[PDB]
Design a protein around this ligand. Structure first.
Ligand SMILES: [Zn+2]
Ligand SMILES: [Zn+2]
Lengths: 436, 436
């Protein structure tokens, strides 16, 4: 039974405060550290920030921590809830909040408790967390599926100087036969990319962004993709490694058109592209490079351009800003056949139960699910166990650099070793890992 | 009693393989992850690397992992050693190796076992790791001392483009009253530095090095220090934050002289400085900026320049490359009165026992001890508990960015909270934390 619930302020990978929750039961203390989320959020669960410009530049979580300690904990303790009953945990928390976006107690306060409980239930049942999450999500467990990691290697858009408007370039070692081999190949590609980067752009270019990728000053999409192809080739893994893109197109959508030179800042509007023109540019890249996944190719509310594109895409299309892990939004996305993969961000919805339902609804529509990290990550490895528990076959948790990223990748190494013959690597079937 | 010893390959914060050890006792499985070290090392313990250019670019640790599993484990299990007897653990490992630099089994293989055992002994004794390390080192425990963190904020030298030859610039919030306050102020300085950096040098300048600091293209030492002073001022903590420098001068020592434009690469030798001229340049900086610590001001074998400088320094002088955590070297450093602080890198010597003896010898000579991270760090928080156990009052474990760095800083937050009135923050007495 839960005897104590406590929260404290700790730091995320960007050096901003975040909430750490510890839940005590008869079996020990279980901890969860929440990643940073959004405090202003239409369609998303809102994390609570202090707003006191005199402390942490207005990003403290003292209120949130207060909500956990002074409000949730006494209630939670008295409710006597069975932690093995995740939905009972979550319904309890939501009910305590009473808002649609968890803006009363804060999504960061609620999520912290929701995840710690799941750790505590696994402890109780005596199984690894991933097996517990498999149970709660009703996933097949014969065998378990290890994911292809979509590794961030290079960043453009708002994350870099240069003209490049596309935000993220990832490599996915779909050709490996095991998770350990996929990670080894993926790191070799990364290191070669870093050497090529420093060689062509300067020692400066070799420094990393928040998720571990480089951000040289690149002018075009072909420039970025050529660099990546060279790195793949240099490591000797041509054919075994595919590319994934995150266009984050909402960043350059203006006046109903897409500004590919949005950093311009005298960007010629005669050159802005309509949805259809932009689709032609993607088709182009898709023909020359081994791209197998494109995230957010169109803006968050440009439904017609997604639908249009989806018709002829032929590769996985991932919804991130389109859906913001919001069930009403997902439902519409499915209905409009706007894409076929959901980027899942647990702190965007706020509870583990609601995260699992969103994945289940996706799977039921034939969609794939890509479990994702956040910009501000922590040393907590939760999403590693969650991608295995959900059997999605694909995770986006950063480059093979920066331990808030490697902590998850190292955790997948351990899980893979622990399962022995009871695990298969998703490989080329990443899109539909749930059905392997 | 130890029933099993196992090792596996996992990744460090740079994406290179490292060794993870798990030790099983009647109380559970205890893990340790070793940071990356040197495989070629005169005066230092050598970590073992595979050297197979076809895998991980020649940086695998499969041999090392083999050494643990096939060689150390069976021996260790059969020896029946009391893990509470750290020296018995370590002597056993060393004896198994039989070399002065652990080049037979590999320092990475030995260290992994040495640290896991200490975790297992704490478990057994039923105390937090830091209390166990306090016991083993015979440190005062009334009260415990929390360290001033020397946070990396900006890098030059080999770590950056630009002319700046000095390698590391750190801030140390000596003016805070608690570890939590020191970390909060230190992060505020860091964030302001990042904004100023991006504003003056470009979005590019805002990307981070291996330890979390920025590396804009800076030309001079005054340029770097002015930027830092502006950041301190901008955050409103003038007076509460001091500067620490790591000159890593061995990198620019050539022909008996110091090349401050070593990146030149037409560096005018008419401009190279002798030890004495270089001392004058430091005295200069020391008069204009709030510098309270200087690491490696002179080259690894330039004994006369350290001695000379030390005479008039008046601030803490830290030996890193001079000593390479090597007891014979330390002894000479003490004897020559070359410095008054030892940079302690546990994997540089290879065992926890030998790490504690090196600190004890330092303290006995009146020296301070700065516990340090490595370039290639992991999610393991070991050095957090070790700096508290040793009562040094000072740690260098990176910027408040990148979780391999924040994992330690978050761990110090937890320790501080756990100790309540039994802890004091070293503050301005960091140099001699052991004697508070
Ligand atoms: Zn996205
Ligand atoms: Zn140094």
């Amino acid at each position: 039974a839960v005897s104590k619930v406590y929260a404290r302020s700790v730091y995320d990978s960007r050096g901003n405060p975040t909430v750490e929750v510890e839940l005590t039961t008869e079996k020990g203390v279980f901890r969860s550290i929440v990643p940073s989320g959004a405090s202003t959020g239409v369609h998303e669960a809102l994390e609570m920030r202090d707003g006191d410009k005199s402390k942490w530049m207005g990003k403290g979580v003292l209120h949130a921590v207060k909500n956990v300690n002074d409000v949730i904990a006494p209630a939670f303790v008295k409710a006597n809830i069975d932690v093995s009953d995740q939905k009972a945990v979550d319904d309890f928390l939501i009910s305590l909040d009473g808002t649609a976006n968890k803006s009363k107690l804060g999504a960061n306060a609620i999520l912290g408790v929701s995840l710690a409980a799941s750790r505590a239930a696994a402890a109780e049942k005596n199984v690894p967390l991933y097996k517990h999450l498999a149970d709660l999500s009703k996933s097949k467990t014969s065998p378990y599926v290890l994911p292809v990691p979509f590794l961030n290697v290079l960043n453009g858009g708002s994350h870099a100087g240069g003209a490049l408007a596309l935000q993220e370039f990832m490599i996915a070692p779909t050709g490996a036969k095991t998770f350990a081999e996929a990670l080894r190949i993926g790191s070799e590609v990364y290191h070669n990319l870093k050497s090529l980067t420093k060689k062509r752009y300067g020692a400066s270019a070799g420094n990393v962004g928040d998720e571990g990728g480089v951000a040289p000053n690149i002018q075009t999409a072909e420039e970025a993709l050529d660099l990546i192809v060279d790195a793949i080739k240099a490591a000797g893994h041509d054919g075994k490694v595919k590319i994934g893109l995150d266009c984050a197109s909402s960043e350059f959508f203006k006046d109903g058109k897409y500004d590919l030179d949005f950093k311009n800042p005298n960007s010629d509007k005669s050159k802005w592209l309509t949805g259809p023109q932009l689709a032609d540019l993607y088709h182009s890249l898709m023909k020359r490079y081994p791209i197998v996944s494109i995230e957010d190719p169109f803006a968050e509310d440009d439904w017609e351009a997604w639908s249009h594109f989806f018709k002829t895409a032929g590769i996985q299309i991932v919804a991130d800003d389109l859906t913001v892990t919001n069930p009403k939004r997902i439902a519409t996305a499915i209905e409009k056949k706007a894409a076929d993969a959901l980027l899942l961000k647990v702190n965007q919805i706020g509870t583990l139960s609601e995260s699992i339902k969103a994945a289940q609804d996706s799977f039921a529509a034939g969609w794939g699910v890509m479990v994702s990290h956040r910009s501000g990550e922590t040393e907590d490895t939760f999403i590693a166990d969650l991608v295995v528990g959900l059997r999605t076959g694909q995770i986006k948790t950063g480059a093979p650099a920066r331990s808030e990223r490697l902590a998850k990748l190292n955790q997948l190494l351990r899980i893979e070793e622990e399962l022995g013959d009871n695990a298969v690597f998703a490989g080329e079937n990443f899109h539909h890992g749930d059905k392997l």
